[PDB]
């Protein structure tokens, strides 16, 4: 059925009359006079009239000879068990040349709210891939742990690093990774393209791409497409899913473009007022379900505008993201990779992950001593520069000799080295070479003698 | 019935015609799916409906049926030990009928179980006139709490037939005469959620609530029916503090309300609440607790109506004569729910985007709580003490939510994450925290104890304020320039904030300190500082009075772990101090 | 009066009534619902046969088809009478207490009328509040608009209650009265006032208008105009010295923005309405003396400064309509100073009119400037002591430092239930000046030192 009753074409929006049965937020299809076809959705429906927003804009659309088709279904995603290994774009269609994937069903991408009764707690450690994460800031299956970054920092290499070195200790090929690219350039897009395939980690992951020069509506659907596929594999096929999103600042930027163009009152910093409520609909899609196998876990990557946490984009996530992973530019332009500062970056769920079986007993106590030896070693370097090397005592001198040495080996472990969890604790004791017996009082002393 | 027809669906706004009989603020089922909404405005027959759930799939032509009632809650037996969702929908019953893990849209179901048989024991006699709030009988809903079935509001007359037996919440158990005719009333009743319950008169809240926590009950107390705000930043351990106030409080009922809380945080409260044991009975704390839980991604109007649901339920238990305590965590997320609904209605922005009526909504909430006299011919008394957790904007208390809250509340417990990092628990700052009840609690404390308690907390607070002044002096001139007399003020404040203020919530002897033991603990430390100052006045220095009384001061640290059954040791420490220090 | 059953639209607190005639602006209405509930209202706009009304209690539960609107034909009025003294009323003047309802001598609009500039008389006589910080350094004068600036949680309700108990005129042939107007306060503060006013017998000299915080926003705005109408009646028609005390004035401004946001009006500074300066001036200018009349109206508006900021719009605009301010600081309240009145930033523009011989003793202005200058150097030396220790303070710097300590604990801190007469306040000021050597007292004339200085 084709409708030719286009009355108004004002900017991105479009008015259609002489319709019936149309529902709210229903996906439509526009046939132009030149044969080219564009897709949109209904923003509002009044009586027989309806307002629709075209995704690719309305540039060069003759209202008279054009046609409109109402698809009778909201924005859905065709899910299937064999999505692993295929690259999709923001709308959920195949990006590169692959066989026609026949879905099992179509699910609403807006998701369903989990009953807090059926929501299980997260209590299982997962491979964090980099000694800085496996110890200072551990991550649990079903945890919203973001990585704050900045423009120019090597966060895209860190994002691709976790794509390989993250797995479940008990893996029966069920563990998968859902990597969602949000508004990245072609060079950054091709970086994830060549990395995932040439490393052999693309057949274990479902990646949704989104060109930087793409309709801003697709950047809004890109996370909801990834989280819908993440909930399908975990809650209907019983799989452990790790969700990666880059970049979330481009998502909020695209959401501000849509809000400003849809004639709405902005909030602070020019970003929309319902930005926090909209982000909560994406980060609450992670966690475990009571009485179910598998879980969905998210690691959102976002660049901080002007590297200031008072900005609403890093702050509003703080209201819904348990902890943070701070990437500082001061550690950049150096050999440290990944540049990670363990002073502001915290994790609130390291207790449930640290325990018998999933981790070992010494992992917790060594972490607390490492964090104390680091802050005392860095405090000794700042004091020796200002107050001179004469004011520092013999204990304060040997303390800073390891803040720098640890940053070259503990923080800097290489962007491609796996550095498996077993290798992270063993060299953990190698890190405190001249730490005095008095300084190990905070940790249990039997653990030091046992190891 | 009259069923309207939708004519426009624009986001959360749905307009339907042929709704002339309907009234403002009435709930209604929208569309074929049956989603619930609220009529906000009405222009002739056409009415604008504010849906609560998502409208993806609703269109013109679908029917709309008015429920004929505003947002109300069912009040009767079977409400205790339940998990609600802000609009009083049992999530456990929801999961049994829907048979799914996720919350389903368009699902309506009664709150209380209309099939469970309850035994009604009639205490009223036939032929006795009754008024609104009069008790006709009781039902043992739990082993701890008796459910007083009372006459609903707006019913006056004499009862003709009333008998005891086993009935459900829909079976008519009593008939009262009215001017219209005979009126059969069940043991359950509804009440609007945005309208307070009528009372005889509200009273001044003067009875201090025994919280058990030494830092609160001594310096910053809260009376029965009073209000109190809590920041609760990260790592401050507000989760452990809320449980201590929920277990060792002399209130009869606890109503925990979660207004738009994080899901991971919410599932913690769901798990760790049926684990709390009752101090006296020993049963689960859910036998005296009505819980309400809302996830952050849940419908916005449910997160706004959550704070109004718990306070309405608490008023029902308050009318029965019980002392109720409602815990609101986190009231900041509820303020962000209003900021979302205000934007959905295109309202004028107020401070930081919050609506201009944010203060009036907060005032309406805390003004409904308090020690009042319930309706009836016996003038029974109930109270609703309000404890709220205000999530700041990263720790800064300049948020409009905290400032508008503190203008109507009289108690503020300042949780400091810096004290949590210093192993000081409960991490409550003793300078920024305050309580406008200490002057009134001081009168009550001096009466029942028959001691001079108001002047002890005043001096103990003074040497903590003098500690703050001497702290910056020590950090400025050092430790060689401070006075000898002022050294004792720092040594008794160290002996106060450690031997008294520090309280372990997991130690079976220290988790609760009786009102009598707080006085004995406060006196020993204060008398130690008063006997040392008078001794210092004549030929005394610190190298001989502090290193010669190490056996006595070490004893004060273990005084907090003394058994509450005897408590004979602490009273013997007072006379023991004056004996050892006089020999010097 | 006839009932109108034509309600076309119900949009929020507003309501559209059609097919009416003879309806005036701002007149009161009564709404009868299907249930029979009665709800007051006010006409906000009327054109042709249509009429727009705003309901006070709200709009919940109203069916347009089966409801009616009654037009009373009069605006908001107050039944003034001489029997109102000793009675507690609500926001609009209904008997809040359980007492016999008064027989109104007349009905007056709450807006009132503007005072003729040539008929207004200058302030002359001095009002003894019994508080040393307000009788000596910042004197109160008949017809002056002297407000009190406080913070959230500061003891400004005890201060307002104390002044209402201790305020008096030192003349025999006069009738003194207090019009206490509670504006959007909580029940616990409202219970404190009503209980204290009956505990000390001050209710026998007061007319109280108690408006709660959960009361409708309209009653919060009408509460000052209601009380000020009864104030002008007792002073200008019954010839009484009327002292008006308003609390809280910040709640009044919070009610204006809440109303202005519902009216879709454009906000001014900090979202407050652009007409906040004028709406406040409508209230604060309803005071002063009138030629030929013995009565007078004096206003002490209490307001809480948001964020303890003086540059905030509410405290700033009030300073442009009032003749000074009385600042309450938390630092003094932290040291138990009651009342915590910081005399350094407080001021009375008309203090010179009620001082000197005949209104006070001859040493009022002299000791005022000496105490003010001595307390300045005292707190200057105290602040200078924290920066560079107590070693850098000179002999006089340590003397003034001890002066500032005793000036707070013995002079300002008097207690909320201590009514110092004006002679006790002056004699006490000379006792504190005895700490300083006679050489420091440069402003006080040598003849005054030989007469009063101990």
Short mmCIF file of N, CA, C and O in Angstrom, two decimals, chain B residues 303-384:
data_model
loop_
_atom_site.label_atom_id
_atom_site.label_comp_id
_atom_site.label_asym_id
_atom_site.label_seq_id
_atom_site.Cartn_x
_atom_site.Cartn_y
_atom_site.Cartn_z
N UNK B 303 8.08 6.68 39.21
CA UNK B 303 9.13 7.18 40.09
C UNK B 303 8.68 8.43 40.84
O UNK B 303 9.16 8.69 41.95
N UNK B 304 7.76 9.20 40.27
CA UNK B 304 7.24 10.37 40.96
C UNK B 304 6.19 9.98 42.00
O UNK B 304 6.16 10.54 43.10
N UNK B 305 5.33 9.02 41.67
CA UNK B 305 4.28 8.59 42.58
C UNK B 305 4.79 7.67 43.68
O UNK B 305 4.01 7.30 44.57
N UNK B 306 6.06 7.28 43.63
CA UNK B 306 6.59 6.36 44.64
C UNK B 306 6.64 7.02 46.01
O UNK B 306 6.22 6.42 47.01
N UNK B 307 7.13 8.26 46.08
CA UNK B 307 7.23 8.94 47.37
C UNK B 307 5.84 9.20 47.95
O UNK B 307 5.67 9.25 49.17
N UNK B 308 4.83 9.35 47.09
CA UNK B 308 3.48 9.58 47.57
C UNK B 308 2.78 8.28 47.96
O UNK B 308 1.84 8.32 48.77
N UNK B 309 3.22 7.15 47.43
CA UNK B 309 2.60 5.87 47.77
C UNK B 309 2.98 5.44 49.18
O UNK B 309 2.12 5.05 49.98
N UNK B 310 4.28 5.50 49.50
CA UNK B 310 4.72 5.06 50.81
C UNK B 310 4.21 5.95 51.93
O UNK B 310 3.87 5.46 53.01
N UNK B 311 4.14 7.26 51.69
CA UNK B 311 3.66 8.16 52.73
C UNK B 311 2.16 7.98 52.94
O UNK B 311 1.65 8.20 54.05
N UNK B 312 1.43 7.56 51.90
CA UNK B 312 0.01 7.29 52.07
C UNK B 312 -0.21 5.98 52.82
O UNK B 312 -1.10 5.90 53.68
N UNK B 313 0.59 4.96 52.52
CA UNK B 313 0.51 3.71 53.26
C UNK B 313 0.91 3.92 54.71
O UNK B 313 0.28 3.37 55.63
N UNK B 314 1.95 4.72 54.95
CA UNK B 314 2.37 5.00 56.32
C UNK B 314 1.29 5.75 57.09
O UNK B 314 1.18 5.59 58.31
N UNK B 315 0.49 6.57 56.40
CA UNK B 315 -0.60 7.26 57.07
C UNK B 315 -1.71 6.30 57.47
O UNK B 315 -2.40 6.52 58.47
N UNK B 316 -1.91 5.23 56.70
CA UNK B 316 -2.93 4.24 57.05
C UNK B 316 -2.54 3.49 58.32
O UNK B 316 -3.37 3.30 59.22
N UNK B 317 -1.28 3.06 58.41
CA UNK B 317 -0.80 2.43 59.63
C UNK B 317 -0.72 3.42 60.78
O UNK B 317 -0.83 3.03 61.95
N UNK B 318 -0.54 4.71 60.48
CA UNK B 318 -0.49 5.72 61.53
C UNK B 318 -1.88 5.95 62.13
O UNK B 318 -2.01 6.17 63.34
N UNK B 319 -2.92 5.91 61.29
CA UNK B 319 -4.28 6.10 61.80
C UNK B 319 -4.68 4.98 62.76
O UNK B 319 -5.51 5.20 63.65
N UNK B 320 -4.11 3.79 62.60
CA UNK B 320 -4.40 2.69 63.51
C UNK B 320 -3.78 2.88 64.88
O UNK B 320 -4.11 2.12 65.80
N UNK B 321 -2.91 3.87 65.05
CA UNK B 321 -2.26 4.13 66.31
C UNK B 321 -0.81 3.69 66.41
O UNK B 321 -0.23 3.78 67.49
N UNK B 322 -0.21 3.23 65.31
CA UNK B 322 1.17 2.78 65.32
C UNK B 322 2.11 3.92 64.95
O UNK B 322 1.74 4.86 64.26
N UNK B 323 3.35 3.81 65.42
CA UNK B 323 4.40 4.76 65.08
C UNK B 323 5.16 4.21 63.87
O UNK B 323 5.87 3.21 63.98
N UNK B 324 5.00 4.87 62.73
CA UNK B 324 5.57 4.40 61.47
C UNK B 324 6.80 5.24 61.14
O UNK B 324 6.93 6.39 61.57
N UNK B 325 7.71 4.64 60.39
CA UNK B 325 8.90 5.32 59.90
C UNK B 325 9.06 5.00 58.42
O UNK B 325 9.16 3.82 58.05
N UNK B 326 9.08 6.03 57.58
CA UNK B 326 9.20 5.87 56.14
C UNK B 326 10.59 6.33 55.72
O UNK B 326 11.02 7.44 56.07
N UNK B 327 11.30 5.49 54.98
CA UNK B 327 12.64 5.79 54.49
C UNK B 327 12.57 6.08 53.00
O UNK B 327 12.15 5.22 52.21
N UNK B 328 12.99 7.28 52.61
CA UNK B 328 12.99 7.71 51.21
C UNK B 328 14.43 7.73 50.72
O UNK B 328 15.24 8.54 51.19
N UNK B 329 14.75 6.83 49.80
CA UNK B 329 16.08 6.74 49.19
C UNK B 329 15.89 6.37 47.73
O UNK B 329 15.38 5.29 47.44
N UNK B 330 16.29 7.26 46.83
CA UNK B 330 16.91 8.53 47.15
C UNK B 330 16.03 9.67 46.64
O UNK B 330 15.69 9.71 45.46
N UNK B 331 15.69 10.60 47.54
CA UNK B 331 14.77 11.67 47.18
C UNK B 331 15.31 12.57 46.07
O UNK B 331 14.54 13.33 45.47
N UNK B 332 16.61 12.50 45.79
CA UNK B 332 17.17 13.27 44.69
C UNK B 332 16.71 12.73 43.34
O UNK B 332 16.41 13.51 42.42
N UNK B 333 16.66 11.41 43.20
CA UNK B 333 16.18 10.81 41.96
C UNK B 333 14.70 11.12 41.73
O UNK B 333 14.26 11.21 40.58
N UNK B 334 13.94 11.27 42.81
CA UNK B 334 12.54 11.68 42.67
C UNK B 334 12.45 13.11 42.13
O UNK B 334 11.54 13.42 41.35
N UNK B 335 13.37 13.98 42.54
CA UNK B 335 13.39 15.34 42.01
C UNK B 335 13.73 15.34 40.53
O UNK B 335 13.21 16.17 39.77
N UNK B 336 14.60 14.43 40.09
CA UNK B 336 14.89 14.31 38.67
C UNK B 336 13.73 13.72 37.89
O UNK B 336 13.65 13.91 36.67
N UNK B 337 12.82 13.01 38.56
CA UNK B 337 11.61 12.54 37.89
C UNK B 337 10.66 13.70 37.61
O UNK B 337 10.03 13.74 36.55
N UNK B 338 10.54 14.63 38.56
CA UNK B 338 9.75 15.84 38.31
C UNK B 338 10.35 16.67 37.19
O UNK B 338 9.62 17.22 36.36
N UNK B 339 11.68 16.77 37.15
CA UNK B 339 12.33 17.52 36.08
C UNK B 339 12.06 16.90 34.72
O UNK B 339 12.04 17.61 33.71
N UNK B 340 11.83 15.59 34.67
CA UNK B 340 11.47 14.94 33.42
C UNK B 340 10.01 15.18 33.06
O UNK B 340 9.69 15.49 31.90
N UNK B 341 9.11 15.06 34.04
CA UNK B 341 7.69 15.30 33.77
C UNK B 341 7.42 16.77 33.47
O UNK B 341 6.51 17.08 32.69
N UNK B 342 8.18 17.68 34.08
CA UNK B 342 8.02 19.10 33.76
C UNK B 342 8.40 19.39 32.32
O UNK B 342 7.74 20.19 31.65
N UNK B 343 9.46 18.75 31.83
CA UNK B 343 9.83 18.92 30.43
C UNK B 343 8.84 18.28 29.48
O UNK B 343 8.61 18.81 28.38
N UNK B 344 8.24 17.16 29.87
CA UNK B 344 7.22 16.53 29.05
C UNK B 344 5.96 17.38 28.95
O UNK B 344 5.20 17.23 27.98
N UNK B 345 5.72 18.26 29.92
CA UNK B 345 4.57 19.16 29.89
C UNK B 345 4.93 20.56 29.43
O UNK B 345 4.05 21.43 29.41
N UNK B 346 6.19 20.80 29.05
CA UNK B 346 6.66 22.11 28.61
C UNK B 346 6.35 23.19 29.64
O UNK B 346 5.65 24.17 29.37
N UNK B 347 6.88 22.99 30.84
CA UNK B 347 6.70 23.94 31.94
C UNK B 347 7.90 24.88 32.02
O UNK B 347 8.98 24.59 31.51
N UNK B 348 7.68 26.02 32.67
CA UNK B 348 8.74 27.01 32.81
C UNK B 348 9.88 26.44 33.64
O UNK B 348 9.64 25.89 34.72
N UNK B 349 11.13 26.56 33.19
CA UNK B 349 12.26 26.04 33.97
C UNK B 349 12.50 26.86 35.22
O UNK B 349 12.43 28.09 35.21
N UNK B 350 12.79 26.16 36.31
CA UNK B 350 13.28 26.76 37.53
C UNK B 350 14.78 26.56 37.69
O UNK B 350 15.51 26.39 36.71
N UNK B 351 15.22 26.56 38.94
CA UNK B 351 16.65 26.46 39.23
C UNK B 351 17.22 25.13 38.75
O UNK B 351 16.72 24.06 39.11
N UNK B 352 18.28 25.21 37.94
CA UNK B 352 18.94 24.03 37.37
C UNK B 352 17.96 23.09 36.67
O UNK B 352 18.15 21.88 36.66
N UNK B 353 16.91 23.65 36.07
CA UNK B 353 15.94 22.87 35.34
C UNK B 353 14.81 22.30 36.18
O UNK B 353 13.77 21.94 35.62
N UNK B 354 14.98 22.22 37.49
CA UNK B 354 13.92 21.71 38.34
C UNK B 354 12.71 22.65 38.30
O UNK B 354 12.87 23.87 38.15
N UNK B 355 11.50 22.11 38.42
CA UNK B 355 10.30 22.94 38.32
C UNK B 355 10.23 23.97 39.44
O UNK B 355 10.88 23.84 40.48
N UNK B 356 9.41 25.00 39.21
CA UNK B 356 9.27 26.07 40.18
C UNK B 356 8.47 25.65 41.41
O UNK B 356 8.54 26.33 42.44
N UNK B 357 7.72 24.55 41.33
CA UNK B 357 6.96 24.03 42.45
C UNK B 357 7.66 22.88 43.15
O UNK B 357 7.01 22.09 43.85
N UNK B 358 8.98 22.75 42.97
CA UNK B 358 9.72 21.68 43.63
C UNK B 358 9.68 21.83 45.14
O UNK B 358 9.61 20.84 45.87
N UNK B 359 9.73 23.07 45.63
CA UNK B 359 9.66 23.28 47.07
C UNK B 359 8.28 22.99 47.64
O UNK B 359 8.16 22.47 48.75
N UNK B 360 7.23 23.30 46.88
CA UNK B 360 5.88 23.02 47.35
C UNK B 360 5.61 21.52 47.40
O UNK B 360 4.93 21.04 48.31
N UNK B 361 6.12 20.78 46.42
CA UNK B 361 5.94 19.33 46.43
C UNK B 361 6.68 18.70 47.61
O UNK B 361 6.16 17.79 48.26
N UNK B 362 7.90 19.17 47.89
CA UNK B 362 8.63 18.68 49.05
C UNK B 362 7.93 19.06 50.34
O UNK B 362 7.89 18.27 51.29
N UNK B 363 7.38 20.27 50.41
CA UNK B 363 6.67 20.70 51.61
C UNK B 363 5.42 19.86 51.84
O UNK B 363 5.11 19.51 52.98
N UNK B 364 4.70 19.53 50.77
CA UNK B 364 3.52 18.68 50.91
C UNK B 364 3.89 17.29 51.42
O UNK B 364 3.08 16.65 52.09
N UNK B 365 5.09 16.82 51.11
CA UNK B 365 5.49 15.48 51.52
C UNK B 365 5.78 15.44 53.02
O UNK B 365 5.17 14.65 53.76
N UNK B 366 6.70 16.28 53.49
CA UNK B 366 7.12 16.22 54.89
C UNK B 366 6.05 16.76 55.84
O UNK B 366 6.10 16.44 57.03
N UNK B 367 5.10 17.55 55.34
CA UNK B 367 4.04 18.06 56.20
C UNK B 367 2.98 17.01 56.51
O UNK B 367 2.25 17.16 57.49
N UNK B 368 2.89 15.96 55.70
CA UNK B 368 1.96 14.87 55.97
C UNK B 368 2.47 13.94 57.06
O UNK B 368 1.66 13.25 57.69
N UNK B 369 3.77 13.91 57.31
CA UNK B 369 4.35 13.08 58.35
C UNK B 369 4.40 13.84 59.67
O UNK B 369 4.46 15.07 59.70
N UNK B 370 4.37 13.08 60.77
CA UNK B 370 4.46 13.68 62.08
C UNK B 370 3.58 13.01 63.12
O UNK B 370 2.74 12.16 62.79
N UNK B 371 3.77 13.38 64.38
CA UNK B 371 2.97 12.85 65.48
C UNK B 371 1.62 13.56 65.51
O UNK B 371 1.56 14.77 65.75
N UNK B 372 0.55 12.82 65.25
CA UNK B 372 -0.79 13.37 65.15
C UNK B 372 -1.73 12.56 66.03
O UNK B 372 -1.34 11.57 66.65
N UNK B 373 -2.98 13.00 66.09
CA UNK B 373 -4.05 12.29 66.77
C UNK B 373 -5.00 11.76 65.70
O UNK B 373 -5.63 12.54 64.98
N UNK B 374 -5.11 10.44 65.61
CA UNK B 374 -5.92 9.82 64.57
C UNK B 374 -7.41 10.03 64.85
O UNK B 374 -7.83 10.33 65.97
N UNK B 375 -8.21 9.85 63.81
CA UNK B 375 -9.66 10.01 63.93
C UNK B 375 -10.26 8.85 64.72
O UNK B 375 -9.80 7.71 64.66
N UNK B 376 -11.31 9.16 65.46
CA UNK B 376 -11.99 8.17 66.26
C UNK B 376 -12.56 8.80 67.52
O UNK B 376 -12.35 9.97 67.80
N UNK B 377 -13.28 7.97 68.27
CA UNK B 377 -13.89 8.38 69.53
C UNK B 377 -13.02 8.05 70.73
O UNK B 377 -13.51 8.11 71.87
N UNK B 378 -11.76 7.69 70.52
CA UNK B 378 -10.83 7.39 71.60
C UNK B 378 -9.56 8.23 71.56
O UNK B 378 -8.79 8.20 72.53
N UNK B 379 -9.32 8.97 70.47
CA UNK B 379 -8.19 9.89 70.36
C UNK B 379 -6.86 9.16 70.54
O UNK B 379 -6.03 9.53 71.37
N UNK B 380 -6.65 8.12 69.74
CA UNK B 380 -5.38 7.42 69.74
C UNK B 380 -4.34 8.23 68.96
O UNK B 380 -4.67 9.06 68.11
N UNK B 381 -3.07 7.97 69.25
CA UNK B 381 -1.97 8.75 68.70
C UNK B 381 -1.08 7.89 67.83
O UNK B 381 -0.75 6.75 68.18
N UNK B 382 -0.68 8.44 66.68
CA UNK B 382 0.29 7.82 65.82
C UNK B 382 1.34 8.83 65.38
O UNK B 382 1.20 10.03 65.63
N UNK B 383 2.38 8.33 64.73
CA UNK B 383 3.47 9.19 64.29
C UNK B 383 4.14 8.59 63.06
O UNK B 383 4.20 7.37 62.91
N UNK B 384 4.63 9.47 62.20
CA UNK B 384 5.35 9.08 60.98
C UNK B 384 6.66 9.86 60.97
O UNK B 384 6.67 11.06 60.69
#
